[PDB]
Amino acid sequence: SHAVKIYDTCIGCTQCVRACPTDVLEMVPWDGCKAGQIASAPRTEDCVGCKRCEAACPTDFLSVRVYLGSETTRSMGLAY
Amino acid sequence: TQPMWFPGMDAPQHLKGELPGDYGFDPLNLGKEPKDLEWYVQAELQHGRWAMLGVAGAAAPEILTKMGISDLPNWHDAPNYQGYFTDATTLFWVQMLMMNWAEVRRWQDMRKPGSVDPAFSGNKLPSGIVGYPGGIFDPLGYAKGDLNKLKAKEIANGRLAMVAFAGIMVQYDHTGVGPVANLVAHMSDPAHNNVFQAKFIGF
Amino acid sequence: DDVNVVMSASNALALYLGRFVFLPYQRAQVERVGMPTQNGQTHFAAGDTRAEEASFITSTNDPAGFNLVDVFAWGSIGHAIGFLALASQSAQQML
Amino acid sequence: RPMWFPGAHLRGDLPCDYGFDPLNLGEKPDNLARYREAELMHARWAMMGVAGAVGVEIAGQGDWASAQPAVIGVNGVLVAFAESQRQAATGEARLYPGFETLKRKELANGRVAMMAFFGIMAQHQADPSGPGPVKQLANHLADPWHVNVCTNPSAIPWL
Amino acid sequence: QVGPPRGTMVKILRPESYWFNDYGKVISVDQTGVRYPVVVRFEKVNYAGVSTNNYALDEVEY
Amino acid sequence: RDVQPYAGLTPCKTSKAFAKREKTELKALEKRLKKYDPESAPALALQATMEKTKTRFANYGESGLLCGKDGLPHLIVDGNLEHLGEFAIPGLGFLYVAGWIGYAGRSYIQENKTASKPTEGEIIIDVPKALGLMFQAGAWPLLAGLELKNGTLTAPESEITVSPR
Numbered sequence: 020s021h022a023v024k025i026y027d028t029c030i031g032c033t034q035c036v037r038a039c040p041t042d043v044l045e046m047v048p049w050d051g052c053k054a055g056q057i058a059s060a061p062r063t064e065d066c067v068g069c070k071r072c073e074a075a076c077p078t079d080f081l082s083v084r085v086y087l088g089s090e091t092t093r094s095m096g097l098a099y
Numbered sequence: 100t101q102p103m104w105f106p107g108m109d110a111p112q113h114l115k116g117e118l119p120g121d122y123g124f125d126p127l128n129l130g131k132e133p134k135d136l137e138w139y140v141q142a143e144l145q146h147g148r149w150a151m152l153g154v155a156g157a158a159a160p161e162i163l164t165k166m167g168i169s170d171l172p173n174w175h176d177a178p179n180y181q182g183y184f185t186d187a188t189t190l191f192w193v194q195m196l197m198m199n200w201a202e203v204r205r206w207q208d209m210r211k212p213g214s215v216d217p218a219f220s221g222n223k224l225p226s227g228i229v230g231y232p233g234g235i236f237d238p239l240g241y242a243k244g245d246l247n248k249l250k251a252k253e254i255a256n257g258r259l260a261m262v263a264f265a266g267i268m269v270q271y272d273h274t275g276v277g278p279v280a281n282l283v284a285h286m287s288d289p290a291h292n293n294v295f296q297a298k299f300i301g302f
Numbered sequence: 303d304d305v306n307v308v309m310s311a312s313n314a315l316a317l318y319l320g321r322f323v324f325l326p327y328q329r330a331q332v333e334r335v336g337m338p339t340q341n342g343q344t345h346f347a348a349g350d351t352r353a354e355e356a357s358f359i360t361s362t363n364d365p366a367g368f369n370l371v372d373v374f375a376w377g378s379i380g381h382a383i384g385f386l387a388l389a390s391q392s393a394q395q396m397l
Numbered sequence: 398r399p400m401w402f403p404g405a406h407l408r409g410d411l412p413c414d415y416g417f418d419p420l421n422l423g424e425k426p427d428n429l430a431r432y433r434e435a436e437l438m439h440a441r442w443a444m445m446g447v448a449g450a451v452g453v454e455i456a457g458q459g460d461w462a463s464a465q466p467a468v469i470g471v472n473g474v475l476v477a478f479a480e481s482q483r484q485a486a487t488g489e490a491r492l493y494p495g496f497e498t499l500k501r502k503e504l505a506n507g508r509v510a511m512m513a514f515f516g517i518m519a520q521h522q523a524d525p526s527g528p529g530p531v532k533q534l535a536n537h538l539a540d541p542w543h544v545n546v547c548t549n550p551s552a553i554p555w556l
Numbered sequence: 557q558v559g560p561p562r563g564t565m566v567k568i569l570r571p572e573s574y575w576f577n578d579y580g581k582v583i584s585v586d587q588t589g590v591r592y593p594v595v596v597r598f599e600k601v602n603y604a605g606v607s608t609n610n611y612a613l614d615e616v617e618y
Numbered sequence: 619r620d621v622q623p624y625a626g627l628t629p630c631k632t633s634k635a636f637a638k639r640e641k642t643e644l645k646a647l648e649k650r651l652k653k654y655d656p657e658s659a660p661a662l663a664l665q666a667t668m669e670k671t672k673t674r675f676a677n678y679g680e681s682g683l684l685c686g687k688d689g690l691p692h693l694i695v696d697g698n699l700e701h702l703g704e705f706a707i708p709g710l711g712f713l714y715v716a717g718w719i720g721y722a723g724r725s726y727i728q729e730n731k732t733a734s735k736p737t738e739g740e741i742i743i744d745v746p747k748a749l750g751l752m753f754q755a756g757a758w759p760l761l762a763g764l765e766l767k768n769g770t771l772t773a774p775e776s777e778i779t780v781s782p783r
């Protein structure tokens with residue numbers, strides 16, 4: 020599957036999570052930002068790689084990054 | 100508050116007025132800082148003096164030829180004229196050798212009047228305002244009278260002579276005859292020897 | 303014999319030149335310029351066993367340590383100079 | 398302080414210094430020492446070669462290039478030995494084997510000789526190599542207003 | 557209070573930032589010991605269209 | 619003017635191939651003309667075209683052009699004094715005009731950058747100020763020289779955004 024990494028510049032705006040079409044990302048408590056929450060990618064196996072999270076991340080440069088890797092059935096988004 | 104080129108409006112801020120010739124004329128704002136302003140005051144001085152000499156030396160062969168007391172050539176073909184002591188290029192290189200020294204010394208004065216004669220070690224230059232050295236440069240040397248008036252007179256005469264020299268350069272470029280010949284032709288038929296008959300026969 | 307005199311003399315001359323004139327400079331340069339090193343260590347020190355330095359290159363009774371490799375280098379230079387001289391001379395003679 | 402024009406890394410210790418460093422090549426102190434010695438050697442060779450060239454040019458008339466043509470070996474070995482010995486020494490003592498104003502005037506006259514030799518090189522290239530530098534000087538002494546550089550059509554374009 | 561005061565122009569030092577080597581107004585600095593407390597506002601938008609983001613104290617200069 | 623041959627190119631005025639070019643074109647014009655009666659407007663238009671061709675070929679002859687084997691003028695752009703009007707003088711005119719355009723643009727962009735909303739004025743051009751800067755850009759070479767000498771032509775390295783590399 021692909022690799023999704025969350026970096027400490029995340030402000031916890033949740034937009035990456037709300038943008039994910041496969042429920043890869045989730046918000047977890049975190050003291051580093053003001054909002055009090057950082058994203059995470061537990062279900063990385065379900066990442067199709069559409070990079071909607073990167074498009075929806077406001078922080079410059081991006082706090083969420085998707086690195087395309089080994090392609091599985093789920094990553095390829097195949098109904099067959 | 101000085102006499103102004105455009106009486107209705109007000110002079111620009113960077114033109115103080117004390118300059119010998121400041122009539123507030125700077126529509127395209129080239130003045131700006133005082134530093135390049137000084138580079139311009141000196142440039143205007145040099146252009147005025149050189150063009151006064153230029154107009155006088157481009158007229159004098161013409162006046163002498165037309166009066167018939169010295170059959171000299173026209174200023175434009177003066178370089179083309181043959182009979183000089185040496186080849187055009189030879190005397191040109193000698194000329195630029197002679198001018199390199201004098202003009203670099205003036206540049207040193209432009210940069211620093213104090214910085215700038217070893218030929219006669221007793222002969223020096225009295226200290227003066229930049230662009231107006233005096234001393235040996237004015238053997239007449241009656242500056243005990245009005246000064247700023249005389250400087251303004253030099254500047255305005257220079258400005259006129261430069262306009263005149265550009266005008267005649269264009270006139271030969273459009274008629275190909277001497278400037279005084281152009282002048283007398285305009286006297287002869289004022290309504291039919293003016294600019295409308297200019298044709299640009301040759302550059 | 304013209305070729306033999308000019309050639310042998312030239313080669314020996316080059317040898318002597320290497321032995322005394324540029325020998326201190328050459329040895330100073332090989333002191334200043336270390337052995338070739340890859341990633342900060344010599345080829346042999348990095349594992350290139352075939353880059354083991356030879357032993358005959360230091361076995362010399364010369365006061366100035368003019369080893370066999372120095373002899374071969376300067377003899378090559380002398381042979382190059384001599385044959386250049388011969389070749390040029392032949393050009394100037396018959397061409 | 399004598400200078401290449403009134404009112405303009407360089408110090409008074411360097412002999413015969415006149416502030417002339419537009420390119421600031423001698424800015425670097427290390428390179429400055431090399432440049433000093435470089436000039437020194439250049440002017441020494443230029444004094445000797447000016448003296449040679451005037452002699453050879455005039456020698457049997459002709460030019461310096463005219464009397465120019467295994468022959469290089471003898472000069473090469475001796476000069477290589479002398480140059481290696483000069484190099485191997487230390488700075489500021491490698492010059493004289495065995496006062497200040499004499500160095501000053503030496504270096505000045507040298508710079509004049511270097512410039513003269515460069516002029517010889519340029520004139521020989523520019524001219525068809527017929528007349529030598531001394532012969533060119535004699536021609537200039539004959540009719541300078543009509544044999545100067547601008548009459549030469551090779552130095553300048555447009556004849 | 558730490559970091560630049562509000563309203564000052566700070567030069568960005570983050571290499572990856574779109575506004576690297578550019579100047580931006582400080583909106584607020586968070587004093588609760590967060591990693592990137594410095595909120596900097598920018599006249600020009602990045603490729604994402606945003607005009608602001610967060611920086612650390614060593615990622616800004618004034 | 620009479621120009622010396624250069625780079626194996628004879629002057630167009632004395633070139634037989636140039637005369638052949640003129641002749642050929644004029645004959646083509648005549649052929650085109652022949653089908654029209656002289657009273658009708660195409661006949662006069664074609665005669666005017668023939669006149670224009672003749673005076674063009676004449677002007678190219680007198681203007682010191684060098685023609686080739688093909689018979690068409692060839693430009694000398696190495697800087698030769700006899701052919702400076704080919705490239706140098708129009709080159710100088712272009713450099714002057716293009717620098718005027720660029721300096722008017724630079725002046726307007728720098729002046730509009732001080733506005734409250736610079737990007738709106740970027741598309742809605744302030745025509746009076748624009749024209750003022752345009753006519754001030756007549757002395758572009760001077761003002762550019764001032765900017766170069768004062769160091770304000772070029773922004774310093776630190777202010778410019780660069781890649782992280």
Ligand code: CLA
Pocket residue numbers: 509512513514515516517519520523524533534535537544545546547548549552
């Ligand atoms: C020692 C310096 C020196 C001297 C005395 C000469 C002397 C001469 N040169 Mg040579 N020349 C020199 C340096 C020198 N040159 C240099 C450095 C170059 C390379 C740029 C040339 C390139 C050169 C060419 C291509 C030609 C000459 C020619 C000539 C002759 C006449 C024209 C002339 O001098 O203008 C040329 C002069 C220069 C370009 C000046 C160079 C700058 C010097 C080094 C400054 C110092 C000169 C001197 C000491 C100053 C006082 C002069 C005073 C005695 C009158 C004359 C014999 C011409 C000739 O004989 O054929 C027709 C010729 O065609 N020269």
Ligand code: CLA
Pocket residue numbers: 705708709710712713715716717719720721
């Ligand atoms: C019919 C004639 C003709 C036409 C239609 C064009 C059309 C064009 N030229 Mg060309 N050009 C021509 C003749 C022509 N040129 C001739 C005869 C020359 C010789 C001087 C040139 C030399 C030339 C250069 C060197 C350049 C152009 C460029 C351009 C383009 C933009 C020019 C401009 O003014 O933009 C508006 C002007 C600006 C935005 C200002 C930009 C800077 C300008 C182009 C030059 C000013 C800088 C200064 C003088 C230093 C020049 C350095 C140079 C010598 C290397 C445009 C496609 C430019 C281009 O497209 O390159 C990418 C360019 O760089 N032209």
Ligand code: CLA
Pocket residue numbers: 719720721722723724726727743748749751752
């Ligand atoms: C303000 C005007 C302006 C100026 C001064 C420059 C200057 C420059 N540009 Mg830029 N450029 C401009 C406008 C300008 N450009 C515009 C409008 C475009 C979009 C088409 C570009 C697109 C562009 C590219 C793609 C490249 C450059 C490059 C360059 C450089 C090479 C020379 C050149 O212009 O050739 C290029 C010239 C052109 C592409 C012609 C376009 C210029 C037009 C004609 C100007 C339009 C504005 C005009 C003045 C009106 C506005 C003002 C008015 C309201 C008063 C130089 C730094 C090159 C570079 O980086 O070189 C190092 C390069 O690769 N430019």
Ligand SMILES: CC(/C=C/C=C(C)/C=C/[C@@]12O[C@]1(C)C[C@@H](O)CC2(C)C)=C\C=C\C=C(C)\C=C\C=C(C)\C=C\[C@@]12O[C@]1(C)C[C@@H](O)CC2(C)C
Pocket residue numbers: 417418419420421422438439440442443444445446447449450451453461462464465511512514515
């Ligand atoms: C002029 C010259 C070098 C000049 C260098 C200059 C001006 C550098 C100046 C600068 O660095 C400064 C100072 C300041 C910096 O900011 C800028 C610049 C401006 C860059 C060297 C001459 C160098 C001249 C030399 C070395 C002269 C050599 C003469 C020799 C060998 C004799 C040869 C002959 O005898 C033979 C071999 C065979 C015979 O047939 C022929 C003859 C001619 C008789």
Ligand SMILES: CC1=C(/C=C/C(C)=C/C=C/C(C)=C/C=C/C=C(C)/C=C/C=C(C)/C=C/C2=C(C)CCCC2(C)C)C(C)(C)CCC1
Pocket residue numbers: 313314317373374375376377378381382383385
């Ligand atoms: C005993 C002794 C001695 C002596 C010694 C000697 C003398 C030695 C020598 C040695 C030698 C004597 C050596 C040699 C060497 C040589 C060589 C090594 C060669 C080489 C060659 C080459 C390399 C070649 C090349 C070429 C060719 C092939 C052809 C072409 C051309 C050329 C030339 C390039 C003494 C007394 C001192 C001391 C004691 C001891």
Ligand code: SF4
Pocket residue numbers: 028029030031032033034035036057058075076077078081082083
């Ligand atoms: S990753 Fe970008 S979007 Fe997802 S939370 Fe952190 S900042 Fe908001």
Ligand code: SF4
Pocket residue numbers: 023038039040041042043044065066067068069070071072073085
């Ligand atoms: S890539 Fe598509 S799927 Fe993988 S995380 Fe970003 S948004 Fe969710």
